[PDB]
Amino acid sequence: LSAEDKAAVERSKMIEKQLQKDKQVYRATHRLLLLGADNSGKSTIVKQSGIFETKFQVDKVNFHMFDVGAQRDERRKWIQCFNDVTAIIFVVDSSDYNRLQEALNDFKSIWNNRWLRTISVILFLNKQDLLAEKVLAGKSKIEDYFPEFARYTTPEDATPEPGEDPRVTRAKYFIRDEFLRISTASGDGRHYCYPHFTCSVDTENARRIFNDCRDIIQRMHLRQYELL
Amino acid sequence: NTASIAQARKLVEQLKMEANIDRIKVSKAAADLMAYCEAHAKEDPLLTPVPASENPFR
Amino acid sequence: ELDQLRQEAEQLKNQIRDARKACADATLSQITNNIDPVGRIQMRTRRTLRGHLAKIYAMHWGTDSRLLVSASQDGKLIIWDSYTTNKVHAIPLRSSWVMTCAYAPSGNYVACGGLDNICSIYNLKTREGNVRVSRELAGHTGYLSCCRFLDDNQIVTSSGDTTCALWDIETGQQTTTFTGHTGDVMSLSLAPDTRLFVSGACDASAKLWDVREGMCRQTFTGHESDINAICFFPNGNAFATGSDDATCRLFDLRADQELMTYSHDNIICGITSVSFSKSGRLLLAGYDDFNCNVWDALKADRAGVLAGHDNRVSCLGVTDDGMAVATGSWDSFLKIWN
Amino acid sequence: VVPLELARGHQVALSSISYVGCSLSVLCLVATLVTFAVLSSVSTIRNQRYHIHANLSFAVLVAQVLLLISFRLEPGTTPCQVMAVLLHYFFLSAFAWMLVEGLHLYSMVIKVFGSEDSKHRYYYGMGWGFPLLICIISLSFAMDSYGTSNNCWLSLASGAIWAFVAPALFVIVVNIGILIAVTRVISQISADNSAFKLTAKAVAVLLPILGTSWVFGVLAVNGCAVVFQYMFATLNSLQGLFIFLFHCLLNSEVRAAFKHKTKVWSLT
Numbered sequence: 001l002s003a004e005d006k007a008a009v010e011r012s013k014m015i016e017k018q019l020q021k022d023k024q025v026y027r028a029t030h031r032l033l034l035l036g037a038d039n040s041g042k043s044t045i046v047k048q049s050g051i052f053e054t055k056f057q058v059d060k061v062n063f064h065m066f067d068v069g070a071q072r073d074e075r076r077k078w079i080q081c082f083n084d085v086t087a088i089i090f091v092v093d094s095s096d097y098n099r100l101q102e103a104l105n106d107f108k109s110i111w112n113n114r115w116l117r118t119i120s121v122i123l124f125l126n127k128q129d130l131l132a133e134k135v136l137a138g139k140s141k142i143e144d145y146f147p148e149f150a151r152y153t154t155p156e157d158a159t160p161e162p163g164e165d166p167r168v169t170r171a172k173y174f175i176r177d178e179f180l181r182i183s184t185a186s187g188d189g190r191h192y193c194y195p196h197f198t199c200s201v202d203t204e205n206a207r208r209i210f211n212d213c214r215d216i217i218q219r220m221h222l223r224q225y226e227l228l
Numbered sequence: 229n230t231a232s233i234a235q236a237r238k239l240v241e242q243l244k245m246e247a248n249i250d251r252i253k254v255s256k257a258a259a260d261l262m263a264y265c266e267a268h269a270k271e272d273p274l275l276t277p278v279p280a281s282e283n284p285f286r
Numbered sequence: 287e288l289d290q291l292r293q294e295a296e297q298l299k300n301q302i303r304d305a306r307k308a309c310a311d312a313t314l315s316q317i318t319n320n321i322d323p324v325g326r327i328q329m330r331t332r333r334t335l336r337g338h339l340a341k342i343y344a345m346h347w348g349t350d351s352r353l354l355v356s357a358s359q360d361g362k363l364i365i366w367d368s369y370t371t372n373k374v375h376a377i378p379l380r381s382s383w384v385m386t387c388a389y390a391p392s393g394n395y396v397a398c399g400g401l402d403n404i405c406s407i408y409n410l411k412t413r414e415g416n417v418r419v420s421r422e423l424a425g426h427t428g429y430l431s432c433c434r435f436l437d438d439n440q441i442v443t444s445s446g447d448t449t450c451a452l453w454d455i456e457t458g459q460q461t462t463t464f465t466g467h468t469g470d471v472m473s474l475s476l477a478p479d480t481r482l483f484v485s486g487a488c489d490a491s492a493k494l495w496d497v498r499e500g501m502c503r504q505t506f507t508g509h510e511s512d513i514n515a516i517c518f519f520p521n522g523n524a525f526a527t528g529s530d531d532a533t534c535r536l537f538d539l540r541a542d543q544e545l546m547t548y549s550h551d552n553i554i555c556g557i558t559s560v561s562f563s564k565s566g567r568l569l570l571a572g573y574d575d576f577n578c579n580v581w582d583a584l585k586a587d588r589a590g591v592l593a594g595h596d597n598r599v600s601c602l603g604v605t606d607d608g609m610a611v612a613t614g615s616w617d618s619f620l621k622i623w624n
Numbered sequence: 625v626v627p628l629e630l631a632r633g634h635q636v637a638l639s640s641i642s643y644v645g646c647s648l649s650v651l652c653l654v655a656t657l658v659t660f661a662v663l664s665s666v667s668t669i670r671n672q673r674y675h676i677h678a679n680l681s682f683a684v685l686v687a688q689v690l691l692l693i694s695f696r697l698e699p700g701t702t703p704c705q706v707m708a709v710l711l712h713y714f715f716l717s718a719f720a721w722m723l724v725e726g727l728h729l730y731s732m733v734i735k736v737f738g739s740e741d742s743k744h745r746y747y748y749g750m751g752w753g754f755p756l757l758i759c760i761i762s763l764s765f766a767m768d769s770y771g772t773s774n775n776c777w778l779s780l781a782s783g784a785i786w787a788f789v790a791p792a793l794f795v796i797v798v799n800i801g802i803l804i805a806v807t808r809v810i811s812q813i814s815a816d817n818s819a820f821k822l823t824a825k826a827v828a829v830l831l832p833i834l835g836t837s838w839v840f841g842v843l844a845v846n847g848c849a850v851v852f853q854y855m856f857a858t859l860n861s862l863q864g865l866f867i868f869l870f871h872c873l874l875n876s877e878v879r880a881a882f883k884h885k886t887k888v889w890s891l892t
């Protein structure tokens with residue numbers, strides 16, 4: 001090192017200092033994948049020309065939301081760079097009784113991939129209001145859509161909202177069970193499925209994401225510690 | 229529609245012009261490749277190891 | 287009608303294949319056998335470039351064979367010296383994820399692209415000030431994959447809109463769009479001559495493209511998998527492709543047919559990157575089996591291995607002077623072999 | 625306090641068992657140390673926890689070797705009193721190291737948010753300064769009470785044992801609390817589904833490397849020390865074998881790293 005190439009050394013040292021400073025922010029930021037489709041509650045959840053981003057503060061822990069607006073039919077192309085994500089958010093309509101089997105097919109497709117078979121999936125439910133006036137109205141009966149309604153009993157582990165007729169909770173647990181049936185087949189590794197039931201205009205969402213991510217991180221760390 | 233018809237016509241013209249491409253035996257191309265590999269073999273410090281003298285990475 | 291067009295566009299492909307069979311008289315594994323094999327190669331790395339924040343995806347080498355680029359998921363562009371293992375400039379950018387690196391031949395313009403559908407070019411040598419944006423470029427509804435500079439005023443690129451397009455720095459307007467591909471294009475390389483360039487897509491096909499007229503010159507054959515990377519021979523008459531089929535292929539531009547099948551029974555992992563050297567005897571190709579691999583070109587014989595990376599590789603390149611080989615891998619590590 | 629260590633009927637099968645256990649522990653621990661030294665380039669063994677394991681194993685190994693040498697040394701001779709303080713310092717360093725490991729486990733389990741903080745300086749400081757402070761405060765006043773007539777260890781009938789039993793009790797109480805909390809968490813997790821299998825595995829895994837087996841010493845020193853010394857010796861001297869076996873042959877990440885390194889070595 002002659003007496004010319006020493007300013008570059010201190011410049012590089014400063015660059016490493018800036019990178020180490022950035023580390024303290026990058027390592028403490030949690031990022032999520034927010035999937036979904038149209039006619040869902042994307043506008044409501046996102047309100048709290050390529051890749052979009054929204055920032056929100058929850059319990060003094062930074063969180064990152066990622067949603068795309070230029071995704072074609074193909075999905076496996078850019079999914080390669082999604083392996084480092086922590087949890088995956090899935091949004092379903094659950095109000096219109098049609099456009100539901102496609103959601104299950106999408107759930108199976110994401111749940112059965114090979115590269116990302118280490119990320120858990122966070123379920124969600126939207127448009128709780130629209131479901132209410134549809135079940136009590138004898139126009140769009142769910143029996144004609146799914147013919148297994150005649151064979152269904154409300155599970156014992158139930159937390160019904162007060163003032164709800166048995167049909168409403170029956171339909172809610174119908175959706176929950178039909179969403180959980182696919183998940184219990186595969187998996188058995190480091191990822192599970194976490195059904196959730198939250199309204200659209202509500203603030204308890206952050207608590208739900210907090211508890212889900214805390215449980216996932218705790219399970220992952222305990223598994224890494226050989227205890228399980 | 230008209231856009232699909234135009235795209236089909238463009239691809240048909242492309243395929244028609246694909247036939248009017250000069251063709252020569254791959255043996256001649258292989259000969260040129262071998263000649264280039266053999267002639268440009270001394271001036272490459274990968275296949276032939278170089279002494280540490282004329283090596284800035286040493 | 288569409289059925290009539292589909293029926294009519296069969297015999298011409300049939301006679302193209304017949305001409306391919308007629309022209310194919312011999313193969314490299316049948317005429318190149320008297321040459322001396324390269325033998326064992328003990329390439330041991332001396333410098334290990336660390337400091338990247340997260341997994342990297344691309345790299346390039348400058349004209350001076352001194353400055354190299356690399357980008358990561360964190361959204362930083364850094365240019366190093368590769369001699370005193372030091373960095374000259376760190377370039378943050380708006381798009382938090384990037385997918386492309388490129389260095390201009392004059393060593394002034396660096397192009398960064400990703401899935402943001404915006405092409406950003408940075409003027410490293412400013413008149414008075416630090417690094418600043420030069421001219422944003424957009425117009426593609428798909429995700430950009432890769433781009434390589436051709437001159438200082440124009441640049442070609444590949445996007446997620448199953449089509450290719452070139453842009454002029456002045457007026458920033460797309461002149462002639464390159465259309466004809468069905469699958470998503472995810473690989474593109476240039477040629478020493480500024481007249482022709484090739485690209486590969488997920489349709490297991492490649493097409494030769496012309497810069498000036500924007501008309502597809504030649505079409506390649508099947509690859510049985512999605513093409514990820516492509517490289518061009520220095521002579522300008524051959525190119526090598528890669529895919530997830532674990533079979534690298536070397537198709538000559540003049541021949542436009544499959545000649546070499548880099549098939550090994552042990553390997554099952556796909557190929558990530560491919561780059562040649564000046565001599566053309568050797569060829570290094572990154573692998574998804576958690577390490578790098580070399581491959582002789584004229585001979586289908588293994589010539590040692592290049593292992594040492596914790597994670598799978600993502601990029602690989604060879605300097606212009608053909609002295610060092612640098613490989614990038616997902617473990618946030620940059621390794622350069624002398 | 626009356627020692628009541630070995631009067632008659634328990635003197636035999638004590639020193640020989642100690643020798644056998646120490647030999648097994650030293651072999652296993654030197655194997656663990658050489659394995660850690662070899663397996664340091666890859667990313668799997670790059671976290672803070674493995675550094676804690678390495679330094680803890682080194683401290684235990686050096687303390688055990690020093691004790692083995694201390695067994696064969698004449699009393700009333702200067703090197704004996706020179707190395708007694710080293711013996712005590714090394715044992716206290718091991719105690720503080722498993723205390724730090726327990727604190728790290730507590731911060732990792734119940735406080736998952738903030739585990740990755742790069743606290744290397746604080747861990748080393750609190751692991752290698754507390755024994756030094758205890759040693760200097762002991763040598764400030766306790767000098768004559770550092771060599772007895774029986775063996776090279778310090779006298780236990782002068783009140784100078786304060787530097788060991790109190791830290792032992794503190795570490796044991798903290799360990800009991802942490803283990804109870806972790807066992808409750810594990811039982812809650814496992815209640816959502818083999819009932820008494822994962823809990824037993826966790827207890828056995830956390831027993832030797834963290835140090836919850838020192839409770840028997842209190843009973844051994846005072847109160848019906850007839851049958852509770854065989855278990856003390858067997859479960860304390862053979863700490864090496866236990867830690868080596870468990871956290872070097874059952875750790876999932878260690879095996880994968882070793883296989884990868886073997887593949888790399890065989891490639892060239």
Ligand SMILES: C[C@]12CCC(=O)C[C@@H]1CC[C@@H]1[C@@H]2CC[C@]2(C)[C@@H](O)CC[C@@H]12
Pocket residue numbers: 629642711712715777778
């Ligand atoms: C308490 C001592 C001596 C004091 C000390 O530093 C700890 C050490 C622990 C092992 C003990 C040893 C005293 C002699 C004992 C009790 C032998 O009987 C077998 C184990 C030995």
